[PDB]
Amino acid sequence: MRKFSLNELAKVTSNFNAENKLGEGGFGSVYRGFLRDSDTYIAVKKVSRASKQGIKEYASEVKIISRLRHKNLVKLIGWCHERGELMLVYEFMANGSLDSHIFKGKSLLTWEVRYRIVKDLASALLYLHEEGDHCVLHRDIKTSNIMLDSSFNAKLGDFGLARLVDKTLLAGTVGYMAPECLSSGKASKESDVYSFGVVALEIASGRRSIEPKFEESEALLLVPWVWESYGNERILDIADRKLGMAFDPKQLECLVMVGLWCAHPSHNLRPSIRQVIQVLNFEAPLPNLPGSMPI
Ligand SMILES: CCS(=O)(=O)Nc1ccc2c(c1)/C(=C(/Nc1ccc(CN3CCCCC3)cc1)c1ccccc1)C(=O)N2
Ligand SMILES: [Mg+2]
């Protein structure tokens, strides 16, 4: 990666023209930038200085992402810290973020691609939690933070809330936050695994955690409805309607039970991400879950 000047970033984004906006990132808008000399595109995130948290999330992102290299993690390809303006530069990924496919119908993700994506995300988390000089707690795992390459391989990004292990402000995304986050404030590997659980269930079901859009059910949230479905031996009902019957039932069961295990209300009953990967690959047994979600 390298240092970009404000002027060159202005030039390649056409002064951050609205027609070049790709979407909203976690702490700024992202713009498509065109490199004339390479005939290639990049993605430029322009940081929002509208709270003080903008500069904190930029600083966290640079610090953390600089320490990470993995096939299932987004790579930083440059930065800019010049006058007041803070910016971050990444590869342009034409398939965009996972949420656009699974919730917004940009494409129909096949069962085989979805199961692969969950394994990709699990690999990323294993690397974060266990493979570095320091454990990295991500703190904002969700499908809008998962990028897709041309082959639909998944890369986890957004390190603006991420922290190295050896007091943080309570922060995160409502619908992905473990209950102990709100009661105690404490982030852990187990709180990251909770968010992974929620994501796994979103991917299986094509339903957003906070807005599942049930027509025949009164549940307002995804996880309780999945848990109730599992306890009534209705795992098949969980699967994204759009898939019809084109999915593997054994893998669906596995995905759902792993998701609930990860999303256990009690942090001490959640698996390690390494145990999750073993179960997803049928190298270790399915978890023993109660049929009712614990209160
Ligand atoms: C870690 C998540 S983040 O905070 O956003 N970080 C991030 C980091 C690197 C990135 C992107 C995002 C990104 C996006 N691409 C992108 C976006 C949209 C589209 C879709 N067309 C359709 C035509 C009109 C413009 C948008 C294509 C690529 C994108 C931007 C915002 C929201 C989501 C994706 C990309 O190519 N490289
Ligand atoms: Mg975030």
From TrEMBL:
Keywords assigned: ATP-binding, Cell membrane, Glycoprotein, Kinase, Lectin, Membrane, Metal-binding, Nucleotide-binding, Receptor, Signal, Transferase, Transmembrane, Transmembrane helix
Q: How does it sit in the membrane?
A: Single-pass type I membrane protein
Q: Where in the cell is it found?
A: Cell membrane
Where does the record place the Protein kinase domain? 16-289
Q: Which residues bind ATP?
A: 46
* A single cellular component GO annotation: extracellular region
Residues annotated as binding Mg(2+) are: 140, 158
Q: In terms of one coarse class, where is the protein primarily found?
A: membrane
One Gene Ontology BP term is: defense response to oomycetes
In which family does this protein belong, per the annotation? In the N-terminal section; belongs to the leguminous lectin family. In the C-terminal section; belongs to the protein kinase superfamily. Ser/Thr protein kinase family.
Protein name, per record = Concanavalin A-like lectin protein kinase family protein
Lineage of source species? Eukaryota, Viridiplantae, Streptophyta, Embryophyta, Tracheophyta
